[PDB]
């Protein structure tokens, strides 16, 4: 009747696996696929998809943890560690009978006390560039190489500052990252306005164009007066010559419209009307548009036109027959960058001072994958910081204070829920201990020093991962997200209670 032992053992095993990953000094994990592809990562959000999990309840914990941390994206490893420690602390008392339901009551009471205590240790300030820089640094050093994260911090914080319209949170589309394969990492710069993935490699593309416009093109050289794109009807003689003429006049009858529009907007494309096409265009049409300053481009992506529609103004719809000059998409400046082999289009000064993009760049996928998910985590963390007005100290400083508050609140609760809150407060201390252990310092000595410092002085002191000393965690600038901590408590308590409440595992 004791399947709780099996569940606890599997949870502890998962804790052991996901340990040694916290802080900037965490050890990376080595994800190898079955085919032979390799992957290096440290964050639990992607690590809890590590091909094989073996134990089924460990898979359950992974599934629920991922599904619930998809809303904050920073408490995964901490969630797993605190779950494992809660289960172990509960087991020390379940071993001597003590039905787990009252343990669950104690856990819930301790959670309420901890949530109450969190509301007064959070510091709310008119956060500025330096504070977001510190937040991004804390969120980045813990997911990528220490030195490398320093350059990405600036490109993240300035991008978020530009994107921040008002109290409304940011949007996922409103910041986009780009992939490219330069030999050297060459930092990562911030580009105002949308960046196009691909372009045509005609020699006469206009580089410096100001106050340009744009329209999307779907099908222009396949079928005459028909939007369908498919195989050619060679058998039908009337259709065969119609599609041959579709090569020339099907594009000319609207290139004339494009050139007359660009002329009546600015003499002989004085402002340089630009065009974009879903696919390739006629080589003669390409030459004509290059000579007319129209810059024909191909290989348009499905995520480009809808992003630039509200960014470049008008509506750059795929279909032809522009007709009314309202759908044309204004572009203050457009550039063509062809670093190494691939060429890129930089759409700047569009009808939006927002919707910027990043420029992550480096060696083959084994590194740029880390770059991209690390910068994504940094962006999400700084987005949480921009959403709330309060931030909390890190380095486990908040949790030592939480454990102290719960211990002092323990005699208030009657019954064995007293013992439950004792176990919860004891288990909350895992993060400082793991942080101290991962840096090579003594696990218990550092915790004892931190507890003594927080007892003698009310400052929320934390662990310093370069000397193993109690550090204030406020002046140093190691702040953590408030919402992340709240969701961490909410997730850990519910998962621990649910696992503690099971019995009689059955083979369905």
């Amino acid at each position: 009747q004791a399947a709780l032992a099996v569940n606890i053992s599997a949870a502890r095993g998962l804790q052991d696996v996901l340990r040694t990953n916290l802080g900037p000094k965490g050890t990376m994990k080595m994800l190898v696929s079955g085919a032979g592809d390799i992957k290096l990562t440290k964050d639990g959000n992607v690590l809890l998809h590590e091909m094989q999990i073996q134990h089924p309840t460990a898979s359950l914990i992974a599934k629920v943890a991922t599904a619930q941390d998809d809303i904050t994206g920073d408490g995964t490893t901490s969630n797993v560690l605190i779950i494992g420690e809660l289960l172990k602390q509960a087991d020390l008392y379940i071993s001597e009978g003590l039905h787990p339901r009252i343990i669950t009551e104690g856990f819930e009471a301790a959670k309420e006390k901890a949530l109450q205590f969190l509301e007064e240790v959070k510091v709310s300030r008119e956060m500025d560039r330096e504070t977001l820089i510190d937040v991004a640094r804390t969120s980045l050093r813990t997911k990528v190489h220490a030195e490398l994260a320093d350059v990405l911090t600036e490109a993240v914080v300035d991008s978020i500052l530009a994107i921040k319209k008002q109290d409304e949170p940011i949007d996922l589309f409103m910041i986009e990252i780009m992939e490219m394969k330069h030999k050297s990492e060459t930092d990562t710069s911030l580009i105002r306005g949308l960046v196009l993935d691909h372009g045509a490699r005609h020699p006469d593309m206009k580089k410096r164009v100001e106050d340009a416009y744009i329209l999307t093109c779907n099908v222009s050289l396949e079928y005459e007066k028909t939007e369908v794109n498919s195989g050619f009807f060679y058998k039908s003689a009337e259709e065969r010559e119609k599609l041959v003429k579709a090569e020339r006049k099907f594009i000319e009858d609207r290139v004339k419209k494009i050139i007359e529009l660009k002329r009546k907007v600015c003499g002989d494309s004085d402002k340089g009307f630009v065009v974009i096409n879903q696919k390739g265009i006629d080589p003669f049409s390409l030459d004509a548009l290059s000579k007319e300053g129209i810059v024909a481009l191909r290989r348009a992506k499905r995520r480009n036109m809808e992003r630039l529609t509200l960014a470049c103004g008008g509506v750059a719809l795929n279909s032809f027959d522009d007709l009314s000059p309202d759908c044309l998409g204004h572009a203050g400046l457009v550039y063509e960058y062809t670093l190494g082999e691939e060429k890129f289009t930089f759409i700047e000064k569009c009808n939006n001072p927002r919707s910027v993009t990043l420029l992550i760049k480096g060696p083959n996928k084994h590194t740029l994958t880390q770059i991209k998910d690390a910068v994504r985590d940094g962006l999400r963390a700084v987005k949480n910081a921009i959403d709330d007005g309060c931030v909390v100290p890190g380095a486990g400083a908040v949790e030592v204070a939480m454990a102290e508050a719960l211990i002092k609140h323990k005699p208030s609760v009657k019954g064995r829920a007293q013992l439950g809150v004792q176990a919860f407060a004891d288990a909350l201390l895992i993060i400082p201990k793991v942080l101290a252990q991962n840096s090579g310092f003594d696990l218990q000595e550092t915790l004892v020093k931190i507890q003594a410092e927080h007892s003698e002085s009310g400052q929320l002191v934390g662990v310093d991962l370069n000397t193993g000393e109690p550090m204030v965690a406020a002046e140093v600038g190691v702040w953590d997200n408030y919402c992340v901590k709240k969701q961490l408590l909410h997730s850990c308590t519910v998962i621990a209670t649910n696992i503690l409440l099971v019995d009689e595992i059955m083979r369905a």
Binding site: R416, V502, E504, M506, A508
Partner: protein
């Protein structure tokens, strides 16, 4: 074998009862489902536990089936039924090893069941009908401890209005109630407050082109299973319909625009792609008639139904409103929200309260929950067995001593000791005559249930006890399983 098969049947009963013995009460423990792929399921409901698990013994299958049939008939209490049946069949082991026949055990069980029925009907507290006060009290008692605590303010009045929409006055005073004839309208979108009630059938299907006299101030519905064609060269059926002069004729086939004009020549409105679960409730609420044989065609082919028809396209979708129906026995209830994950549960608990209400019309009685009723009837039997003699007195007492499993498990899955609490509960339940105390499910402490505020419908308790006793006697009546393996 002989009694070996009896012992095997009741051993299968016991080993299937204790699987879900722990998952009742307000503090039910969770269960683990390990499918042979690796997946794992969190579960509190023992019904799903039994449904997902696979069994090989016919006795276990029969008990699972009886638990189901109790589930879709009366509603809740399946876990209690399984637990009680397992407990009685387990305590029958002692007597089946006394080399004493199952027939006398069966007779003792039947006498015990009759006495338990009597003592429940004696101990039940009365409740008022058509009064929102103790209706809301019952809502606080049983309709709570569900996912409705956040939406009880709407579930309560939805049910309280819904109590008077499915009545049949056949043989007495509103004692007949049918279950599926309530026009459920579950549609997500908008706020949950948009859920309301209406007296009439609500049909989600409509004519393709409503450019005709759809609504008439006295719908005389005629049902027909025939298919409407172009014309005779079938307008002959329409011509025969003209004989009785109706205004609405319901079919189950598509209607064309020219067919629409041919119908409105007779001034009759047809419908298409409708469901039988809609046609039956339409006929029930309208009292119509279906007939197409010319010889049987008489003045009875037209039956007046509603008195007002209306069509509203709420959110560019084709609704059909049939209000003021002749028979208010199949009427509209509306459901609104975002997701159907909880509104279905709230609905089902509301019709559970509906069954509560109809039984209150039959027996307006409530039994004290939290193990109060169980220990009360156990005391009644134990004091009753003193006077009666015979060799069957032992099973009569053992049934009483076995039915106290419900408070025992309520105490067990709370932390408190199940021995001292049970002894104290019995102590303040024998000499204390007019109390009928119970055990708190939350804190595991004895408390007078008249003060805590938990009660159960009489009918559900009666059905659970009767089904448990009948299952026990059925499993004791099986003398051979063998027709093969």
């Amino acid at each position: 074998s002989g009694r070996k098969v009896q012992s095997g049947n009741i051993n299968a009963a016991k080993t299937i009862a204790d699987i879900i013995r722990t998952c009742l009460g307000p503090k039910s423990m969770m269960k683990m489902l390990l499918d042979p792929m690796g997946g794992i399921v969190m579960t509190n409901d023992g019904n799903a536990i039994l449904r997902e698990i696979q069994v090989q013994h016919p006795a276990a299958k029969s008990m699972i089936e009886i638990s189901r049939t109790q589930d879709e008939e009366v509603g809740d209490g399946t876990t209690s039924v399984i637990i009680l049946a397992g407990e009685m069949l387990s305590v029958a082991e002692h007597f089946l090893e006394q080399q004493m026949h199952p027939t006398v055990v069966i007779s003792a069980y039947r006498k015990a069941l009759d006495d338990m029925i009597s003592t429940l009907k004696k101990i039940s507290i009365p409740v008022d009908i058509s009064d929102s006060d103790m209706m809301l009290n019952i809502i606080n008692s049983s309709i709570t401890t569900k996912a409705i605590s956040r939406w009880s303010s709407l579930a309560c009045n939805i049910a309280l209005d819904a109590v008077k929409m499915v009545q049949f006055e056949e043989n007495g005073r509103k004692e007949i109630d049918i279950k599926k004839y309530a026009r459920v309208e579950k549609i997500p979108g908008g706020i949950i407050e948009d859920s309301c009630v209406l007296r009439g059938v609500m049909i989600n299907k409509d004519v393709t082109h409503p450019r005709m006299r759809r609504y008439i101030k006295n719908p005389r519905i005629v049902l027909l299973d025939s298919s409407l064609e172009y014309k005779k060269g079938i307008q002959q059926l329409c011509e025969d319909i003209i004989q009785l002069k109706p205004d609405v004729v319901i079919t189950e086939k598509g209607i064309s625009d020219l067919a629409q004009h041919y119908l409105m020549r007779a001034n009759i409105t047809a419908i298409r792609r409708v469901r039988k679960t809609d046609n039956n409730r339409i006929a029930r609420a309208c009292g119509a008639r279906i007939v197409s044989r010319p010889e049987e065609l008489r003045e009875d082919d037209v039956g007046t139904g509603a008195g007002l028809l209306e069509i509203k396209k709420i959110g560019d979708e084709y609704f059909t409103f049939i209000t003021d129906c002749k028979d208010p026995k199949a009427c509209t209830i509306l459901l609104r929200g975002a997701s159907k994950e909880i509104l279905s549960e709230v609905e089902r608990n509301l019709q559970d309260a509906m069954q509560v209400c109809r039984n209150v019309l039959l027996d307006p009685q409530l039994v004290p929950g939290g193990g109060a009723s169980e220990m009360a009837v156990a005391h009644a039997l134990t004091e009753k067995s003193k006077a009666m003699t015979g060799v069957e007195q032992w099973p009569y007492r053992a049934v009483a001593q076995a039915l106290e499993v419900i408070p025992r498990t309520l105490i067990q899955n709370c932390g408190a000791s199940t021995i001292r609490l049970l002894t104290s509960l019995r102590a303040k339940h024998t000499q204390e005559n007019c109390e009928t105390w119970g055990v708190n499910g939350e804190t595991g402490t004895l408390v007078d249930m008249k003060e805590l505020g938990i009660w159960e419908p009489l009918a559900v308790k009666l059905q659970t006890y009767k089904t448990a006793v009948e299952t026990a006697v059925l499993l004791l009546r099986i003398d051979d399983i063998v027709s093969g393996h």
